[PDB]
RNA sequence: ACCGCUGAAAGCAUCUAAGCGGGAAGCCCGCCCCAAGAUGAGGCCUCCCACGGCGUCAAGCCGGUAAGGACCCGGGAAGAC
RNA sequence: CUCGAUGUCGGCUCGUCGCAUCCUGGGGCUGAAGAAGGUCCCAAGGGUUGGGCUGUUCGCCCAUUAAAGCGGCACGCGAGC
RNA sequence: CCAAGUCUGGGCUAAGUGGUAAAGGAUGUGGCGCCGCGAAGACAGCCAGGAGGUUGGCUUAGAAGCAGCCAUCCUUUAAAGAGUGCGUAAUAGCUCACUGGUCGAGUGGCGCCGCGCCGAAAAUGAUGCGGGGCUUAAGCCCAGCGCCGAAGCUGCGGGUCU
């Protein structure tokens, strides 16, 4: 969502690279981190 | 069909650059280069963005038009022809070269095809 | 000849159950001229004279079944087109000519207080200042009456021979009676 | 047929007389109120305050138009007049009673209610 | 470097209006702090603020000391329009000479204050440098 | 770094590795952009890069291989869950005939290779020959039929949970 | 966009670089409308045969072949001409 | 640049781009069950109505509607009113 | 395209960056220093208890790590968790911040860098100058090498003023 400025929720929410892209991931709809 | 044997060449793998380059080179001077190979051909990795640029030849359509060929055949059309001008010789110099698909006379097959091949 | 075709009979409606207007169409079998194939090399149109008597005054189903009637001797009765079907016909516009941007092309003209002022018919404008001279956009008094018109969802209702002729579902053959009609039911949707 | 401010009488008794035609009811564009159709107009004048009253925001439908209606029966029908009936959101009349005939129509587009009240439906 | 008309004719002799220096707590060794590298008539206000919000998030022991302070200022629109411009003041600060000793997060083991200041940098404006002092930070 | 137990006929030509076995008749591909590894009684990873990068490149093949095998000998299995207080299924035709409302159930076919099973209407699952080609299709239906976890019901990957 | 499978480098996970799929009134195709003056003038069928005398690579001047066309006339929802 | 001269507001017509998208599809999000909303990512195809009072645009009001979009191009257009 | 090394040497790119941008992010990648250990046989998989006085103070109607304001100590023993964490009405389960067998040889950390990807949306139609180019493609950094190219400078010869 935040497109710009993502940084680790749940004590897990991972750091993944898709299309060089960095989009938050972690066992929660409440983390759908993306930029 | 069958023709001379003047400029007897082909293509495949090589670098879709200097490739044509000389093609003309002798494309100039005053020679006819009939080869072929298209597909086999070759050119920059980064396929992806690879097939992009020339899709930039793809839908580059300007009311006034702007076809942009859709078979290896071309790819080399452009390019090459690129090497030359557009006054007489040059021109002619574009009829004097000729290539084709598989083989009529004794990564370079994806962008095309891709955008038309 | 890949298809089937003839000319405009005319229109009239009448009967049915609710009632419905169509159009008549003339055409037995206008013979069979060669047939489409690009075999061994370039093949398309031959001509083993067998035509009319005057004609030298000027001297894979569709096409296939053809082979059926085009080898029979030439002609080929029209009508698979049967009971309740959708071919498509391509009339010839209509010598309507060169007209004002009025009907030629939908547009509102000279309003009121000036919708008369011995004023009237005439488009509004072309192009702005900076943009650049002109566009190939805005049509013009683009003549009409001659277009190779046609359409779609062309449903045929019925037919009978006494004279090989066809009854149609809604006319709009484009061109006028005694006119050049060609039909087909192309990529039908009602299928 | 029948829009902007074309007027049309009553045949029911709702307590009206005549009504101006605002919008043709249906959805955007649309430019026409043809019997069966439903109109968004108001009172141009209504009896001595029956129940409606002059200048009353309203909803009425189509039943009388000299515009001539082509019956699927390749037939033709029209009237000496142009007017219709009020309604209760629920395509439901008010006029307790009818007046000049009308046309099958109605039925086809829902309204019986009047369909029969009508002295005669043509 | 345009600066003002004088220290007592235009606008010179103020308090500049702000929120004093020291906070946090002592600490003999532990060198915990912050400085910069950017040049900028440090935005007073912005300034004053910032630092403060710093305390807002911590509270006590962590040399919330801070070695800054504006003392001159700009000016602009007031009068006719654009031409012969008189002057109307507003917004003093001080030149952050291309880096230097900012404020100090100084104390034994109290990073619970390092993160703080940290929060202090985040803020600020001209980027900032996160650092330690003689020894580091413990 | 692995093995090739019983029957694993192995032929690595051009870059293709042909593996013949019991119920695991399979012909897979395998990079020429690297180094093959085979010795008739084992086999393993080849270092055509030795460098982190390609390193993994095969550090993947390894498995890759591992697949051919286990795949060629003992085929694969995907465990599916039929959790629907209305939905339901039980093979029919040379394919499956699931159901879950709407009106028109659906017939799904495991083209040559893939093969589904209706152990018992409620639950089901697939047994192909390539974990690869399996897991995929296996799922490609597990969804095919909305698992909607709004409160519990639908096709779900074995070992799921609930919601709220 | 967006969702997945198979699995490295991170001996555990990951739609992932490489391997394979899902997914849009959207692009390409398809449906109508031109259209090789696209000097790369395209295809094909159906007609017409080697005429005269002159210096030449006379590819230049004449009767021709209704093959064939035209012009002039008479007409067209063909149409300013 | 133009004063040996580029005729300036609103309207009219004829429109043409653009996307930060109003309607429209596709998506992930929700304090989302349904339904309907909110949040944000992808997409411009097509489309985005009658009146009123105002020189006006703007704007308020009336009845619609899926919607009744933001803005370019001398805030397009006077050798077109 | 247009004249001149698809020179050679050794690095760095895997985005077409080059072919405009900032705050701001992230086990991208390549080169440098630190803390702990692998025979107290090490970090990530797996077996298990997943210790007791801890169930302290404001608010308690519920702190009793898993509402939040203050504590942060003691322990009989295999050590310890000021119990960072998903919750519910507080309590009530899991999770390492703790280690045995099974392996076994490199595993996690911050400072210093040189290259690089998100943020970075626009109106006629598209853009490195164009065709174009991914270990001489080519770019960029550090090294040697020879050729181009002005009307400038040498050779040719004439002019002309001081």
mmCIF file of N, CA and C (backbone and C1' of nucleotides) in Angstrom, chain H residues 18-51:
data_model
loop_
_atom_site.group_PDB
_atom_site.id
_atom_site.type_symbol
_atom_site.label_atom_id
_atom_site.label_comp_id
_atom_site.label_asym_id
_atom_site.label_seq_id
_atom_site.Cartn_x
_atom_site.Cartn_y
_atom_site.Cartn_z
ATOM 1 P P G H 18 -2.653 11.044 -25.354
ATOM 2 O "O5'" G H 18 -2.738 11.753 -23.927
ATOM 3 C "C5'" G H 18 -1.784 12.743 -23.566
ATOM 4 C "C4'" G H 18 -1.907 13.064 -22.090
ATOM 5 C "C3'" G H 18 -2.211 11.856 -21.220
ATOM 6 O "O3'" G H 18 -1.018 11.160 -20.884
ATOM 7 C "C1'" G H 18 -3.466 13.780 -20.522
ATOM 8 P P C H 19 -1.076 10.011 -19.768
ATOM 9 O "O5'" C H 19 -1.435 10.828 -18.445
ATOM 10 C "C5'" C H 19 -0.889 10.406 -17.210
ATOM 11 C "C4'" C H 19 -1.954 10.465 -16.139
ATOM 12 C "C3'" C H 19 -2.651 9.143 -15.861
ATOM 13 O "O3'" C H 19 -1.785 8.322 -15.027
ATOM 14 C "C1'" C H 19 -4.211 10.976 -15.933
ATOM 15 P P A H 20 -2.088 7.786 -13.541
ATOM 16 O "O5'" A H 20 -2.522 9.101 -12.745
ATOM 17 C "C5'" A H 20 -3.810 9.131 -12.152
ATOM 18 C "C4'" A H 20 -3.867 10.106 -10.992
ATOM 19 C "C3'" A H 20 -5.125 10.968 -10.953
ATOM 20 O "O3'" A H 20 -6.225 10.258 -10.331
ATOM 21 C "C1'" A H 20 -3.175 12.302 -10.595
ATOM 22 P P U H 21 -7.349 9.717 -11.110
ATOM 23 O "O5'" U H 21 -7.930 10.776 -12.163
ATOM 24 C "C5'" U H 21 -9.324 11.121 -12.161
ATOM 25 C "C4'" U H 21 -10.236 9.918 -12.375
ATOM 26 C "C3'" U H 21 -10.199 8.856 -11.273
ATOM 27 O "O3'" U H 21 -11.451 8.800 -10.569
ATOM 28 C "C1'" U H 21 -10.017 7.861 -13.461
ATOM 29 P P C H 22 -11.841 9.919 -9.484
ATOM 30 O "O5'" C H 22 -13.197 10.504 -10.100
ATOM 31 C "C5'" C H 22 -14.355 10.632 -9.290
ATOM 32 C "C4'" C H 22 -15.612 10.616 -10.140
ATOM 33 C "C3'" C H 22 -16.027 9.246 -10.659
ATOM 34 O "O3'" C H 22 -16.701 8.523 -9.627
ATOM 35 C "C1'" C H 22 -16.263 10.901 -12.354
ATOM 36 P P C H 23 -16.871 6.932 -9.699
ATOM 37 O "O5'" C H 23 -17.433 6.740 -11.185
ATOM 38 C "C5'" C H 23 -18.539 7.513 -11.644
ATOM 39 C "C4'" C H 23 -19.369 6.649 -12.567
ATOM 40 C "C3'" C H 23 -18.745 5.288 -12.784
ATOM 41 O "O3'" C H 23 -19.062 4.426 -11.710
ATOM 42 C "C1'" C H 23 -19.171 6.191 -14.846
ATOM 43 P P U H 24 -18.684 2.881 -11.852
ATOM 44 O "O5'" U H 24 -19.008 2.655 -13.397
ATOM 45 C "C5'" U H 24 -19.259 1.350 -13.868
ATOM 46 C "C4'" U H 24 -18.621 1.186 -15.230
ATOM 47 C "C3'" U H 24 -17.431 0.250 -15.249
ATOM 48 O "O3'" U H 24 -17.885 -1.094 -15.175
ATOM 49 C "C1'" U H 24 -16.958 2.154 -16.548
ATOM 50 P P G H 25 -17.789 -1.894 -13.793
ATOM 51 O "O5'" G H 25 -16.695 -3.016 -14.127
ATOM 52 C "C5'" G H 25 -16.819 -3.822 -15.308
ATOM 53 C "C4'" G H 25 -15.476 -4.330 -15.827
ATOM 54 C "C3'" G H 25 -14.615 -5.067 -14.810
ATOM 55 O "O3'" G H 25 -14.996 -6.431 -14.705
ATOM 56 C "C1'" G H 25 -13.300 -3.444 -15.849
ATOM 57 P P G H 26 -14.801 -7.171 -13.296
ATOM 58 O "O5'" G H 26 -13.214 -7.120 -13.100
ATOM 59 C "C5'" G H 26 -12.361 -7.423 -14.193
ATOM 60 C "C4'" G H 26 -10.898 -7.387 -13.786
ATOM 61 C "C3'" G H 26 -10.570 -7.593 -12.309
ATOM 62 O "O3'" G H 26 -10.641 -8.978 -11.904
ATOM 63 C "C1'" G H 26 -9.336 -5.783 -13.137
ATOM 64 P P G H 27 -10.955 -9.429 -10.388
ATOM 65 O "O5'" G H 27 -9.500 -9.612 -9.743
ATOM 66 C "C5'" G H 27 -9.232 -9.096 -8.441
ATOM 67 C "C4'" G H 27 -7.907 -8.347 -8.384
ATOM 68 C "C3'" G H 27 -7.564 -7.754 -7.025
ATOM 69 O "O3'" G H 27 -7.113 -8.759 -6.103
ATOM 70 C "C1'" G H 27 -7.236 -6.095 -8.633
ATOM 71 P P G H 28 -8.099 -9.312 -4.962
ATOM 72 O "O5'" G H 28 -7.106 -9.676 -3.762
ATOM 73 C "C5'" G H 28 -5.705 -9.539 -3.953
ATOM 74 C "C4'" G H 28 -5.130 -8.426 -3.097
ATOM 75 C "C3'" G H 28 -5.962 -8.011 -1.903
ATOM 76 O "O3'" G H 28 -5.957 -8.970 -0.876
ATOM 77 C "C1'" G H 28 -5.057 -6.103 -2.874
ATOM 78 P P C H 29 -6.832 -8.608 0.408
ATOM 79 O "O5'" C H 29 -6.661 -7.020 0.511
ATOM 80 C "C5'" C H 29 -5.409 -6.449 0.884
ATOM 81 C "C4'" C H 29 -5.610 -5.392 1.954
ATOM 82 C "C3'" C H 29 -6.756 -5.699 2.903
ATOM 83 O "O3'" C H 29 -6.235 -6.296 4.068
ATOM 84 C "C1'" C H 29 -7.097 -3.566 1.920
ATOM 85 P P U H 30 -7.274 -6.821 5.159
ATOM 86 O "O5'" U H 30 -8.239 -5.556 5.357
ATOM 87 C "C5'" U H 30 -8.031 -4.675 6.457
ATOM 88 C "C4'" U H 30 -9.264 -3.840 6.771
ATOM 89 C "C3'" U H 30 -10.514 -4.588 7.221
ATOM 90 O "O3'" U H 30 -10.397 -5.105 8.561
ATOM 91 C "C1'" U H 30 -11.121 -2.963 5.677
ATOM 92 P P G H 31 -11.575 -5.965 9.237
ATOM 93 O "O5'" G H 31 -12.794 -4.926 9.172
ATOM 94 C "C5'" G H 31 -13.820 -4.910 10.162
ATOM 95 C "C4'" G H 31 -13.964 -3.553 10.846
ATOM 96 C "C3'" G H 31 -13.919 -2.302 9.974
ATOM 97 O "O3'" G H 31 -15.173 -2.048 9.350
ATOM 98 C "C1'" G H 31 -12.653 -1.968 11.947
ATOM 99 P P A H 32 -15.229 -1.638 7.803
ATOM 100 O "O5'" A H 32 -14.990 -3.048 7.092
ATOM 101 C "C5'" A H 32 -15.766 -4.174 7.478
ATOM 102 C "C4'" A H 32 -16.298 -4.860 6.238
ATOM 103 C "C3'" A H 32 -16.963 -6.204 6.475
ATOM 104 O "O3'" A H 32 -18.330 -5.987 6.804
ATOM 105 C "C1'" A H 32 -15.404 -6.370 4.693
ATOM 106 P P A H 33 -19.015 -6.832 7.976
ATOM 107 O "O5'" A H 33 -19.186 -8.277 7.294
ATOM 108 C "C5'" A H 33 -18.129 -8.786 6.466
ATOM 109 C "C4'" A H 33 -18.462 -10.029 5.641
ATOM 110 C "C3'" A H 33 -19.511 -9.884 4.533
ATOM 111 O "O3'" A H 33 -18.911 -9.474 3.290
ATOM 112 C "C1'" A H 33 -20.132 -11.633 5.944
ATOM 113 P P G H 34 -19.820 -9.109 2.017
ATOM 114 O "O5'" G H 34 -21.273 -9.452 2.583
ATOM 115 C "C5'" G H 34 -21.632 -10.805 2.813
ATOM 116 C "C4'" G H 34 -22.830 -11.117 1.945
ATOM 117 C "C3'" G H 34 -23.189 -9.946 1.033
ATOM 118 O "O3'" G H 34 -23.042 -10.319 -0.337
ATOM 119 C "C1'" G H 34 -24.754 -10.170 2.803
ATOM 120 P P A H 35 -22.203 -9.381 -1.329
ATOM 121 O "O5'" A H 35 -23.149 -8.097 -1.444
ATOM 122 C "C5'" A H 35 -24.531 -8.293 -1.706
ATOM 123 C "C4'" A H 35 -25.330 -7.043 -1.397
ATOM 124 C "C3'" A H 35 -24.584 -5.731 -1.561
ATOM 125 O "O3'" A H 35 -24.569 -5.337 -2.920
ATOM 126 C "C1'" A H 35 -25.778 -5.710 0.451
ATOM 127 P P A H 36 -23.243 -4.674 -3.520
ATOM 128 O "O5'" A H 36 -23.227 -3.246 -2.806
ATOM 129 C "C5'" A H 36 -24.021 -2.190 -3.326
ATOM 130 C "C4'" A H 36 -24.306 -1.168 -2.240
ATOM 131 C "C3'" A H 36 -23.119 -0.283 -1.861
ATOM 132 O "O3'" A H 36 -23.174 0.959 -2.581
ATOM 133 C "C1'" A H 36 -23.986 -1.380 0.078
ATOM 134 P P G H 37 -21.906 1.502 -3.404
ATOM 135 O "O5'" G H 37 -21.465 2.774 -2.543
ATOM 136 C "C5'" G H 37 -20.144 2.847 -2.027
ATOM 137 C "C4'" G H 37 -20.164 3.077 -0.528
ATOM 138 C "C3'" G H 37 -18.836 3.531 0.057
ATOM 139 O "O3'" G H 37 -18.786 4.946 0.082
ATOM 140 C "C1'" G H 37 -19.806 1.785 1.374
ATOM 141 P P G H 38 -17.569 5.726 -0.604
ATOM 142 O "O5'" G H 38 -16.309 5.242 0.244
ATOM 143 C "C5'" G H 38 -15.755 6.146 1.175
ATOM 144 C "C4'" G H 38 -14.971 5.394 2.223
ATOM 145 C "C3'" G H 38 -13.500 5.228 1.893
ATOM 146 O "O3'" G H 38 -12.814 6.437 2.177
ATOM 147 C "C1'" G H 38 -14.386 3.217 2.766
ATOM 148 P P U H 39 -11.962 7.139 1.026
ATOM 149 O "O5'" U H 39 -10.591 6.334 1.136
ATOM 150 C "C5'" U H 39 -10.471 5.377 2.182
ATOM 151 C "C4'" U H 39 -9.095 4.740 2.191
ATOM 152 C "C3'" U H 39 -8.328 4.868 0.881
ATOM 153 O "O3'" U H 39 -7.428 5.975 0.945
ATOM 154 C "C1'" U H 39 -8.571 2.579 1.446
ATOM 155 P P C H 40 -7.050 6.780 -0.387
ATOM 156 O "O5'" C H 40 -6.100 5.735 -1.155
ATOM 157 C "C5'" C H 40 -4.893 5.262 -0.547
ATOM 158 C "C4'" C H 40 -4.229 4.146 -1.339
ATOM 159 C "C3'" C H 40 -4.110 4.382 -2.837
ATOM 160 O "O3'" C H 40 -2.835 4.891 -3.124
ATOM 161 C "C1'" C H 40 -5.009 2.213 -2.414
ATOM 162 P P C H 41 -2.337 4.838 -4.638
ATOM 163 O "O5'" C H 41 -2.081 3.279 -4.936
ATOM 164 C "C5'" C H 41 -0.911 2.920 -5.683
ATOM 165 C "C4'" C H 41 -1.003 1.613 -6.465
ATOM 166 C "C3'" C H 41 -1.602 1.656 -7.865
ATOM 167 O "O3'" C H 41 -0.784 2.286 -8.834
ATOM 168 C "C1'" C H 41 -2.354 -0.243 -6.818
ATOM 169 P P C H 42 -1.087 1.946 -10.369
ATOM 170 O "O5'" C H 42 -1.044 0.346 -10.338
ATOM 171 C "C5'" C H 42 -0.395 -0.358 -11.380
ATOM 172 C "C4'" C H 42 -1.378 -0.642 -12.497
ATOM 173 C "C3'" C H 42 -1.869 0.577 -13.248
ATOM 174 O "O3'" C H 42 -0.916 1.023 -14.183
ATOM 175 C "C1'" C H 42 -3.612 -0.999 -12.950
ATOM 176 P P A H 43 -1.447 1.983 -15.345
ATOM 177 O "O5'" A H 43 -2.612 1.113 -16.009
ATOM 178 C "C5'" A H 43 -2.663 0.957 -17.421
ATOM 179 C "C4'" A H 43 -4.030 0.448 -17.827
ATOM 180 C "C3'" A H 43 -4.967 1.518 -18.348
ATOM 181 O "O3'" A H 43 -4.725 1.790 -19.709
ATOM 182 C "C1'" A H 43 -6.085 0.310 -16.730
ATOM 183 P P A H 44 -5.081 3.259 -20.229
ATOM 184 O "O5'" A H 44 -5.188 3.064 -21.815
ATOM 185 C "C5'" A H 44 -5.630 4.137 -22.662
ATOM 186 C "C4'" A H 44 -7.045 4.543 -22.301
ATOM 187 C "C3'" A H 44 -7.549 5.862 -22.879
ATOM 188 O "O3'" A H 44 -8.111 5.747 -24.215
ATOM 189 C "C1'" A H 44 -8.165 5.589 -20.555
ATOM 190 P P G H 45 -7.344 5.310 -25.565
ATOM 191 O "O5'" G H 45 -8.160 3.972 -25.910
ATOM 192 C "C5'" G H 45 -8.980 3.386 -24.885
ATOM 193 C "C4'" G H 45 -10.324 2.861 -25.374
ATOM 194 C "C3'" G H 45 -11.396 3.911 -25.654
ATOM 195 O "O3'" G H 45 -11.420 4.210 -27.058
ATOM 196 C "C1'" G H 45 -12.197 2.397 -24.003
ATOM 197 P P G H 46 -11.850 5.657 -27.607
ATOM 198 O "O5'" G H 46 -13.430 5.682 -27.295
ATOM 199 C "C5'" G H 46 -14.135 4.425 -27.188
ATOM 200 C "C4'" G H 46 -15.574 4.495 -26.668
ATOM 201 C "C3'" G H 46 -16.125 5.833 -26.159
ATOM 202 O "O3'" G H 46 -16.882 6.503 -27.194
ATOM 203 C "C1'" G H 46 -16.229 4.203 -24.436
ATOM 204 P P G H 47 -17.104 8.096 -27.221
ATOM 205 O "O5'" G H 47 -18.146 8.334 -26.018
ATOM 206 C "C5'" G H 47 -19.048 7.294 -25.601
ATOM 207 C "C4'" G H 47 -19.772 7.603 -24.293
ATOM 208 C "C3'" G H 47 -19.640 9.027 -23.762
ATOM 209 O "O3'" G H 47 -20.685 9.843 -24.235
ATOM 210 C "C1'" G H 47 -19.180 7.489 -22.024
ATOM 211 P P U H 48 -21.283 10.839 -23.031
ATOM 212 O "O5'" U H 48 -20.789 10.401 -21.578
ATOM 213 C "C5'" U H 48 -21.769 10.285 -20.559
ATOM 214 C "C4'" U H 48 -21.533 11.271 -19.429
ATOM 215 C "C3'" U H 48 -21.268 12.721 -19.817
ATOM 216 O "O3'" U H 48 -22.488 13.425 -19.997
ATOM 217 C "C1'" U H 48 -19.707 12.020 -18.200
ATOM 218 P P U H 49 -22.535 15.023 -19.854
ATOM 219 O "O5'" U H 49 -24.102 15.336 -19.958
ATOM 220 C "C5'" U H 49 -24.689 15.461 -21.250
ATOM 221 C "C4'" U H 49 -26.162 15.090 -21.251
ATOM 222 C "C3'" U H 49 -27.094 16.223 -20.867
ATOM 223 O "O3'" U H 49 -27.322 17.060 -21.977
ATOM 224 C "C1'" U H 49 -27.692 14.341 -19.650
ATOM 225 P P G H 50 -27.811 18.556 -21.708
ATOM 226 O "O5'" G H 50 -29.238 18.345 -21.018
ATOM 227 C "C5'" G H 50 -30.327 17.853 -21.788
ATOM 228 C "C4'" G H 50 -31.612 18.591 -21.454
ATOM 229 C "C3'" G H 50 -31.476 20.095 -21.235
ATOM 230 O "O3'" G H 50 -31.531 20.816 -22.472
ATOM 231 C "C1'" G H 50 -32.547 19.169 -19.406
ATOM 232 P P G H 51 -31.790 22.402 -22.517
ATOM 233 O "O5'" G H 51 -32.751 22.656 -21.259
ATOM 234 C "C5'" G H 51 -32.307 23.434 -20.144
ATOM 235 C "C4'" G H 51 -33.480 23.813 -19.252
ATOM 236 C "C3'" G H 51 -33.334 25.164 -18.562
ATOM 237 O "O3'" G H 51 -34.089 26.131 -19.276
ATOM 238 C "C1'" G H 51 -33.566 23.456 -16.931
#
